Amino acid sequence: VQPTPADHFTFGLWTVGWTGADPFGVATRKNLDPVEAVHKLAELGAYGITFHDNDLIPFDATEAEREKILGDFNQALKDTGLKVPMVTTNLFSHPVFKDGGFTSNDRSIRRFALAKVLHNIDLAAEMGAETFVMWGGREGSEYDGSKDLAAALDRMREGVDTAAGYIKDKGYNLRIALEPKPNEPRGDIFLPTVGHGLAFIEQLEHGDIVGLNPETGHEQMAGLNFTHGIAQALWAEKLFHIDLNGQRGIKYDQDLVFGHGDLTSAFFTVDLLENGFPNGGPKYTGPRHFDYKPSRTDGYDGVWDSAKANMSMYLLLKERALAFRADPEVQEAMKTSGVFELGETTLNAGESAADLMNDSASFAGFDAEAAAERNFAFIRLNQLAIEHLLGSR
Amino acid sequence: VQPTPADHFTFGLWTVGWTGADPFGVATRKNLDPVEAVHKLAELGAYGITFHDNDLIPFDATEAEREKILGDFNQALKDTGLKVPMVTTNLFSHPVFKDGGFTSNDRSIRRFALAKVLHNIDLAAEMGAETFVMWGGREGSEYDGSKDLAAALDRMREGVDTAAGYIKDKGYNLRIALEPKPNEPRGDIFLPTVGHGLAFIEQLEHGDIVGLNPETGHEQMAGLNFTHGIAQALWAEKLFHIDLNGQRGIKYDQDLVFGHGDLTSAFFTVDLLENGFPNGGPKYTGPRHFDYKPSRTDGYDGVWDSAKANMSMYLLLKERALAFRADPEVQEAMKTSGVFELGETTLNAGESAADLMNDSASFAGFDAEAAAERNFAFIRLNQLAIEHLLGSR
Amino acid sequence: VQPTPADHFTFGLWTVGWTGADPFGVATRKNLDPVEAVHKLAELGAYGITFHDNDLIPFDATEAEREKILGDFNQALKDTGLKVPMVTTNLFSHPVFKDGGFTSNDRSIRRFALAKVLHNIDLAAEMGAETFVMWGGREGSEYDGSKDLAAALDRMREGVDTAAGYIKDKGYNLRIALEPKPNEPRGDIFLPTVGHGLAFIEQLEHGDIVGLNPETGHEQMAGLNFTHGIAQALWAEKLFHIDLNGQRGIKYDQDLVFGHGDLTSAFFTVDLLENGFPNGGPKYTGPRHFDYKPSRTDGYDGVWDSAKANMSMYLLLKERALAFRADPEVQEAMKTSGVFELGETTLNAGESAADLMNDSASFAGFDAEAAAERNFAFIRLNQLAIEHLLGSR
Amino acid sequence: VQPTPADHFTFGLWTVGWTGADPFGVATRKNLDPVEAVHKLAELGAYGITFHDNDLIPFDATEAEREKILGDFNQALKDTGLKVPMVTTNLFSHPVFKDGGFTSNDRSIRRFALAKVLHNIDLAAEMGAETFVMWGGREGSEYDGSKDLAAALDRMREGVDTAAGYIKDKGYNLRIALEPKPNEPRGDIFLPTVGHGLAFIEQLEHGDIVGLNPETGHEQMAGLNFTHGIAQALWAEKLFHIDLNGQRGIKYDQDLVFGHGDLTSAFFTVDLLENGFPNGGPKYTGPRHFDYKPSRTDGYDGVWDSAKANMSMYLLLKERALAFRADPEVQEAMKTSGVFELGETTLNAGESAADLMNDSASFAGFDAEAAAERNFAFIRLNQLAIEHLLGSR
Ligand SMILES: [Mn+2]
Ligand SMILES: [Mn+2]
Ligand SMILES: [Mn+2]
Ligand SMILES: [Mn+2]
Ligand SMILES: [Mn+2]
Ligand SMILES: [Mn+2]
Ligand SMILES: [Mn+2]
Ligand SMILES: [Mn+2]
């Protein structure tokens, strides 16, 4: 263990600051001061802090209040050395955003939400953030006839392209990252998975500066393989930021510590972030952000306990993931299974679809029954990863 | 009821021909002859029939067997008037495809699978099919370390772009449609949802002729809103074909009749296919294909019963969906809820991000607390759709 | 369809009183005065109202306040004629209840919780309720080492048997109804399904007055069939109360209007409540209670609309379900599928095990392959049901 | 970690004998000779073998054939010393069983099924098994009107009580173990979870010799916590046998190696099997049986590897789980979180309901807000568990 600032562990203000109100109860913790949040995070080993506009500045704050709050906030950053790598907007708590922000059926709410985002783009740039996250938590419905589904996507595109266009126009060194979620708070959220988010960016005018912010728990709420999904984001060159946490199953968004959900998936998530791909390719080099919530049953000792535990978890998995790939029996197990063979092109250099046209050598004289005997040995390969994870090897 | 060929009800050979072997048992029905399948379908009102290569021609058939089978097959088509709108390949039953076709770790299997597809592209063109479907049922894994996830997508791209390139090269009037599935038979299938499939096409060299073939049951196995997902496919101009069936929940692929799963979702699926969008936009005009399986407990009377029931179900939902949108109280309910208001651009013609920059009129002097009082009346709107569906209105 | 007090539709105070606060946002509606809840529901057709101690009487209420409130509420009830058939305790909203009431790790909290329940049994008795519901929403854990699981069930048992002992002792006409929920707010809730609730009752010293209160959306949060789950409850004669609502898949507890979730499942629950079992058996006679939440997007006109939609939905389903069983065609199809043959005992009167093994016709010379030919025609009976549901018959 | 017969690892014949046929494909492995299964497992460390009547003796086997096979199998057993601790019946693969065995709609099938079970009780008794498992995989429906649900449970009861009657009558040392499964092959299976299995047993005339056989992946197919579900089974003293495997979410029954699914859940099951309850209580003493399937991608070297991986996984988890509870730090954290306080009865010796309501300290003057301040520190106890699991402690 022992996290240091080069690890790039970033935490949201709303994570440690989450006081415990869930849908069946009131907060169980006293509010956490932001200056206090910054000091504690810096002392634990964090590299940066992120926030939602209304996490720092009340929705109601006056210009005088806004400047007082930013001054103490900015002094704390200064005193500690924490960076502010990502900033986001709250388009979900105020009753006004009850049918959404960008895709609200009410046109005046659409403008209001877009206006709130544009101003937040100015604060992001002022803080030195490199990523602007968008979580469209109220964009969706409970009922299928509540929306014109083509119009909802046109309205989503207008919002995202106006904000991008504005970044480009002002020359901020900022990228937008959309954060998919399948449901909750809405019955169905638009762009519910990594796939949907990625396809959607391809339809934008300014897609070049738009990417994703996948969250472990969120793909797991649809039953999807998180490593598979980030792999696809990474492969497309659109993995701009990431939110790490735990989810045990398809149920409400739990936001547990990273590693306190699906442990084997978390191991393979850390191998992809740290080690990248077996055959070489793209690498994710941004910050490792923890979007979780300290369990409501625990007091403030639990809150600082949970923040350290996320970092701990990631460094213990990282250590076993480095030893796993380094292991000569694993490397040989991988060669047997065809992990490196998958890296070879199917077609020979210069071969055409008519040339191969299945060639036979690859079609007519192929022994399918003999090729089928191959022992891929995937089970033995999986056993090697579990033993490495368990600290056994 | 009373389906007629202008309805464009197409059925797969494997649907009525499915004999009942599941994972816990043997077939409960005698094999169904293809010529017999064509006569029965034509007499029930179908417009066309689709098949997988090995549905008609055994994997082992000789050239002499292949031409005998196509001759009787082609005569039946002739005798009845059925079209052959879609053709697909079996890259999943033979033991050789145990780690996949296009993304097999074994390079020689990759070539073999690609060769089988290329030849099948020639048969598709020969049958007059306009769509070539690809269901990558064995592309995936049980274990996360079994594959190099960037390489698996590169290998998937190579296969799809070689087949497209070949279509283009031969001038066939054919489009490729990928069919997403989240799991089963693999623990995790690559391109598991509509979103993933749509993003993936954006990375291809020949994406222009590649689109999707969403299946009701398959998005519902991830817990997703099927209407939401096809809306997104339609909005992107990539809804090339569709597979309609029933699924009750997240479990194994049931392939029940259309309407025998999530009934309210099926109603809204039929409103989108038939009515399109409230404010106007794109429309799906291809065939309505039924990819289901007659319950194993039923004999052949059940098989012809189930085929008619799919058509019946779609025409009863169609009828209630036309009456629902035509209803002046529904139209007024929609106007109250802001369904048409969602269709208006957020920004005024000529307004810039700095102009609006939230304007206030839309930011600073906005009454958020007053805009929040609005009664969207989505519940009353949902009640109007259920009453129309129930035949009450 | 107009509900009458005779229909026995009950509503909770917390249902139409739900203010809109969820985990991602604040209330969107003003608090509801209890007096008005009562009067409004009385004009809609309700038979009665139900409450949680703290929905009516604030946690911190002084004695003068409590008497006032009860005077006001008892007044409204006398004015309108509304019955109060069920009363329940709030053991989940105050921070003290973060680890549970009955199964909290802290013993003083366990005692407070039980004291809190006993006093509420007195109130329930004063109010004329017949049923006392226990929903243990905070009983469970997020993590597997947090609880000694055998001790969690002894503690659960000790509180439920103490409550029941007290009823018996006091001579009150109250029966306890346990209400299962698999998750939310806890990660895992003790006694998560109807099955676990029924099992637990059998280990109770006073299980004769302890039964179930199954909720539609709760069983669907684990993907079970609600109609099968309440059928087991009935069969064991333990179906004391029922909570009707709607859920649209495995996710957060939506609490949508009855019939606004899984529609065909809603139709079959109503057929079971209304027609009982095809071969005869016990019948459910209690209140038809709705525990739903008016979507937060809707203002007060939506609240009364939603309340009304519950009773409308139920009556429309009832009309269809009665027409379904009354149909000669449906009866014939039920005979053919063996719905009535299931009711015939398998053995012959006084036929023992030995006699069966020894009957040659039954085993040794049974023609398995011939028997397997029966066409159960379950698809066609299902189609008939849906056709009645859609009112096309 | 080397398994010894003392470990009591049992395997089914159908497990390592699984040939690879799934719903989308044919077998990828040759059939396994039973003699070799037995010898191979004996050399790996197995304690015993288990089978389904038809895994060993073909459905259609003549008497000479059956005797031969039994002679061969009994030979191998004498040679190796393998015990046969559990025997079960195949009521799901032949087409006659399409609607179930015990709850088939057809009465002659119900009789055949019961005859088939009785004869298998004789064999089981001859083989020395202590447990007779019933997995009712075809008992259920795809559609809600297919069954009279109260009659489905009477028929279920009649077959299980007849089987148990027969055991008692014959003086056999056999106990019946019911095995739940929520779905697959049927859309909905009767008695879907541990909870429903335990509830049903209580309605049986001979429920004293009828208990449960929970399977890890089965409880996870409904998203329940396996460790909670077997804890209820134990608490009721009804945990007669257990099936260990792995499942990676809500989907088809994967039957992966124990520990190859949800890893932290596997660790806590092992802690419960090995350490029992923190405060004491009953302990599970039967066989540790694995009901898994070697992935079809793997040849025979993979089959024995997978068999071995099950015992390895279990022993490695056991080592960690024992080190976990033996740790002073872990014991201290368990004390602080109230794991031992849960074991203290809530009331005082001879304290009644009345006395509790009346104790002022407990209710009237209880300081709720003070009590709510306790830091349960469940996150830190969870972190300690994972750290032991990862062998970093
Ligand atoms: Mn989240
Ligand atoms: Mn997030
Ligand atoms: Mn399917
Ligand atoms: Mn399909
Ligand atoms: Mn609920
Ligand atoms: Mn309820
Ligand atoms: Mn299984
Ligand atoms: Mn099993």
Residue by residue, DSSP assigns D295-352 as -TT--HHHHHHHHHHHHHHHHHHHHHHHHHHH-HHHHHHHHHTTTTGGGS-SSPTT--
Name the phi and psi angles at B344, rounded to 5: -80, 140
CB D158 within 8 A of CB D201: no
Q: Which two tokens stand for residue A291?
A: 């979007």
A8, A22, A52, A148: the catalytic one is A52
- Cβ contact C150–D203 (<8 Å): no
CB A19 within 8 A of CB C88: no
SS3 C109: helix
Residue matched to tokens 């004498």: D78
SS3 C98: strand
What is the number of the ligand closest to the CA of C185? 5
Q: Which of B24, B97, B188 sits opposite D185 (nearest CB)?
A: B24
The verdict on D20 touching C (C-beta cutoff 8 Å) is: no
Q: Could you give the angle at the alpha carbon of C301 between the alpha carbons of C296 and C307, nearest 5°?
A: 75
CA distance B225 to B216: 9
In B, residues 26-65, which contact A (CB 8 Å cutoff)? 59
With CA atoms as reference, report the closest residue to D154 among C198, C237, C343, C277.
C343
Q: Which two tokens stand for residue D340?
A: 């031992």
With CA atoms as reference, report the closest residue to A142 among A178, A102, A98, A180.
A98
Residue in B59, B91, B181, B252 to test binding to D, most D beta-carbons within 10 Å: B252
With CA atoms as reference, report the closest residue to C283 among C328, C234, C325, C330.
C234
The verdict on C305 touching D (C-beta cutoff 8 Å) is: no
Would you call the peptide bond into A34 cis, given omega within 30 degrees of 0 as the criterion?
Answer: no
C226-235 helix and D149-170 helix, angle to the nearest 10 degrees: 60
Name the phi and psi angles at A284, rounded to 5: -100, 125
CA distance D389 to D266: 10
CA distance D116 to A349: 62
Residues of B with Cβ-Cβ distance to D26 under 8 angstroms: 93-95
Question: Taking the C-alpha atoms of C241, C244, C250 and C252 in order, what is their torsion angle to the nearest 10 degrees?
Answer: -90
CA distance A344 to A361: 17
Q: Which two tokens stand for residue A264?
A: 């084997």
Q: Which of D115, D341, D356 sits opposite C114 (nearest CB)?
A: D356
Q: Which two tokens stand for residue C319?
A: 């009309």
A53, A55, A262, A271: the catalytic one is A55
- Cβ contact D185–B22 (<8 Å): yes
CB C195 within 8 A of CB D218: no
Q: Residue B307 is part of which domain span? A: 1-393
SS3 D132: strand
CA distance C263 to C271: 12
CA distance A337 to A375: 8
Which positions ≥6 away from C264 have C-beta within 8 Å? B260, B263, C385, C386, C389, D144
Neighbours of D376 (CB within 10 A): 23
Residue in B308, B319, B336, B386 to test binding to C, most C beta-carbons within 10 Å: B386
C300-326 helix and B378-389 helix, angle to the nearest 10 degrees: 10
Q: Could you give the angle at the alpha carbon of B60 between the alpha carbons of B57 and B65, nearest 5°?
A: 55
Give chains near D: 3+ CB pairs under 8 A: A, B, C
Q: What are the beta bridge partners of residue C58?
A: none
Resolution in A: 2.5
Distance B179 CA to ligand 4 centre (A): 7
Q: Which two tokens stand for residue D277?
A: 């309850």
Q: What are the beta bridge partners of residue B133?
A: B88, B177
Q: Which two tokens stand for residue A126?
A: 């002022």
Distance from CA of A318 to the nearest CA of B (A): 15
SS3 D203: coil
CB B247 within 8 A of CB B221: yes
Q: What are the beta bridge partners of residue C9?
A: C288
Q: How much is the CA Rg of chain C, to the nearest whole Å?
A: 23
Q: Which of D305, D373, D386 sits opposite A299 (nearest CB)?
A: D373
A-D Cβ pairs (cutoff 8 Å, strict): 127
CA distance B178 to D162: 53
Q: Which two tokens stand for residue C134?
A: 């226990």
Distance of CA B308 to the CA centre of its chain: 19
Which positions ≥6 away from A173 have C-beta within 8 Å? A125, A130
Residue B206's identity, in one-letter code, is: H
CATH of the domain at B192: 3.20.20.150
CA distance D220 to D227: 10
C-alpha distances (whole Å) from C376 to each of A14, B44, B303, C328 are: 57, 22, 12, 18
Annotated ligand binding at A148? The verdict is: no
SS3 D137: coil
Give chains near B: 3+ CB pairs under 8 A: A, C, D
In A, residues 211-250, which contact D (CB 8 Å cutoff)? 223, 248-250
Neighbours of B99 (CB within 10 A): 27
CA distance C202 to C179: 15
CB B216 within 8 A of CB B226: yes
Residue in B251, B296, B305 to test binding to D, most D beta-carbons within 10 Å: B251
Distance from CA of C273 to the nearest CA of D (A): 13
The alpha-helical segments, DSSP class H, found in chain C are 13-16, 34-44, 53-56, 63-80, 107-126, 149-170, 194-201, 216-220, 226-235, 263-275, 300-326, 328-336, 353-358, 368-371, 378-389
CB D9 within 8 A of CB D311: yes
Neighbours of C329 (CB within 10 A): 11
Residue matched to tokens 């009183």: C17
Cβ-in-10-Å burial (0-12, 13-18, 19+) of D326 comes to exposed
C-alpha distances (whole Å) from A38 to each of A11, A72, A75, A83, B393 are: 10, 11, 10, 10, 60
CA distance B364 to D163: 78
Give the H or E element holding residue C50.
strand C48-52
Distance from CA of D117 to the nearest CA of B (A): 18
3-state helix/strand/coil string of chain B: CCCCHHHCEEEEHHHHCCCCCCCCCCCCCCCCCHHHHHHHHHHHCCCEEEEEHHHHCCCCCCHHHHHHHHHHHHHHHHHHCCECCEEECCCCCCHHHECECCCCCCHHHHHHHHHHHHHHHHHHHHHCCCEEEEECCCCEECCCCCCCHHHHHHHHHHHHHHHHHHHHHHCCCCEEEEECCCCCCCCEECCCCHHHHHHHHCCCCCHHHEEECCEHHHHHCCCCCHHHHHHHHHHHCCECCCEECECCCCCCCCCECCCCCCHHHHHHHHHHHHHCCCCCCCCCCCCEEECCCCCCCCCHHHHHHHHHHHHHHHHHHHHHHHHHHHCHHHHHHHHHCCCCHHHCCCCCCCCCHHHHCCCCCCCCCCCHHHHCCCCCCHHHHHHHHHHHHCCCC
Distance C378 CA to ligand 4 centre (A): 23
| DSSP structure string for D280-299 | ------S-EEE-----TT--
CA distance A334 to A325: 10
- Cβ contact D183–B20 (<8 Å): no
CB A138 within 8 A of CB A92: yes
- Cβ contact B390–C386 (<8 Å): no
Experimental method: X-ray
CB D86 within 8 A of CB D241: yes
- Cβ contact A103–B342 (<8 Å): yes
With b for 16 or more beta-carbon neighbours within 10 A and e for fewer, the C61-74 pattern comes to eeeeeeeebeeebe
Distance from CA of A255 to the nearest CA of B (A): 20
* Ramachandran quadrant class, A361 (left: phi over 0; alpha: psi -120 to 50; beta: rest): left
With CA atoms as reference, report the closest residue to B201 among A238, A177, A202.
A202
CA distance A250 to A245: 14
CB D201 within 8 A of CB D207: yes
CB B212 within 8 A of CB B233: yes
C-alpha distances (whole Å) from B249 to each of B124, B193, B261, C280, D251 are: 34, 16, 8, 30, 10
The verdict on D316 touching C (C-beta cutoff 8 Å) is: no
Residue in B144, B317, B366, B386 to test binding to A, most A beta-carbons within 10 Å: B144
C34-44 helix and C300-326 helix, angle to the nearest 10 degrees: 40
CA distance D154 to C231: 12
Would you call the peptide bond into C5 cis, given omega within 30 degrees of 0 as the criterion?
Answer: no
SS3 C49: strand
CA distance A371 to B112: 10
Residues of B with Cβ-Cβ distance to D142 under 8 angstroms: 248, 254, 256, 295, 297
Q: How much is the CA Rg of chain A, to the nearest whole Å?
A: 23
Q: Which two tokens stand for residue D251?
A: 């989907």
Distance of CA D236 to the CA centre of its chain: 15
Q: Which two tokens stand for residue B159?
A: 């296969």
Q: Which of C28, C298, C380 sits opposite B302 (nearest CB)?
A: C380
Q: Which two tokens stand for residue C242?
A: 């029922």
D226-235 helix and D263-275 helix, angle to the nearest 10 degrees: 20
Q: Which two tokens stand for residue D146?
A: 């297919």
CA distance C94 to A368: 66
| DSSP structure string for A42-99 | HHHT--EEEEEHHHHS-SS--HHHHHHHHHHHHHHHHHHT-B--EEE---SSSGGGBT
Q: Which of B195, B343, B362 sits opposite A198 (nearest CB)?
A: B195
Residue of A nearest to C295 (CA): A142
The verdict on C352 touching D (C-beta cutoff 8 Å) is: yes
Q: Which of C23, C185, C251 sits opposite A183 (nearest CB)?
A: C251
Largest CA distance in chain D: 81
Q: Which two tokens stand for residue B324?
A: 């629902």
What is the DSSP code (8-state) at residue A341?
Answer: G
Q: Which two tokens stand for residue A58?
A: 């009340």
CB A50 within 8 A of CB A12: yes
Q: Which two tokens stand for residue B137?
A: 């049922």
Give the H or E element holding residue D215.
none
Neighbours of A68 (CB within 10 A): 13
Largest CA distance in chain A: 81
CA distance D371 to C94: 11
CB D274 within 8 A of CB D226: no
Residues of D with Cβ-Cβ distance to B105 under 8 angstroms: none
Q: What are the beta bridge partners of residue A132?
A: A87, A176
Distance D300 CA to ligand 7 centre (A): 21
- Cβ contact B115–A360 (<8 Å): yes
**Helix, strand, coil content of chain D in percent (nearest 5):** 50, 10, 40
Domains identified in chain D, total number: 1
C-alpha distances (whole Å) from D369 to each of B136, D158, D241, D299 are: 58, 55, 46, 63
Annotated ligand binding at B215? The verdict is: yes
CA distance A240 to A234: 9
